Structure 1
Amino acid sequence: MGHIELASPTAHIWFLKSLPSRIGLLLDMPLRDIERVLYFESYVVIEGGM
């Protein structure tokens, strides 16, 4: 089988989209919050304590 470069990341749109929101489980990302974010639609803070 082949591959592809895939610089644009690809999480399993499988991942965390079923009843087990796996990513919402790991990053604690709220499903609405994570949902708004992945559409590149939030620009949420990532870190930053200062």
Structure 2
Amino acid sequence: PSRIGLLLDMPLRDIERVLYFESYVVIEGGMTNLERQQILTEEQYLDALEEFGDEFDAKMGAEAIQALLKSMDLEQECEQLREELNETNSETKRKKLTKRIKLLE
């Protein structure tokens, strides 16, 4: 498994695309339609910034990954994930959240 992939909890395909400069990823993406870490195609990024030339940041590549990682709190995420793992559901999400919590702790 890829430690980045499941620490940040993003499918490895999308990090593969981002880290070789063929897409865009939002960093904070607040005060707008976008979420924390949506992926964008080049044209999608151009269109989004056109309609939303406000301050939402969407970077491209290693710098974006670094900012996204450095912009996270570990133990708080651990609390949220253990609360969610409390139940709903112990079928495969049980295994997934146990692994992610193991890495985070």
Give the alignment's TM-score, normalised by structure 1: 0.52
1:8-49 per-residue CA deviation (whole Å, 9 max, x = no partner) reads xxxxxxxxxxxx110001111211111100002211112121
Gaps in structure 2 of 5+ consecutive residues: 32-105
Greater Rg by CA: 2
What CA distance in whole angstroms lies between the structure 1 residues aligned with 2:7 and 2:21?
Answer: 19
What CA distance in whole angstroms lies between the structure 2 residues aligned with 1:27 and 1:41?
Answer: 19
| 2:10 match | 29
| 1:41 match | 22
Over 4 Å off, 4+ runs:
none
Letter in 1 for 2:25: V
Quick one: higher RCO (CA 8 Å, sep 6+), 1 or 2? 2
Q: How many positions carry a matched residue from both structures? A: 31
Letter in 2 for 1:40: F
Identity of aligned residues (%): 100
Gaps in structure 1 of 5+ consecutive residues: 1-19
**Structure in which a larger fraction of residues adopt strand:** 2
What CA distance in whole angstroms lies between the structure 2 residues aligned with 1:46 and 1:28?
Answer: 14
SS at match of 1:49: coil
**Structure in which a larger fraction of residues adopt helix:** 2
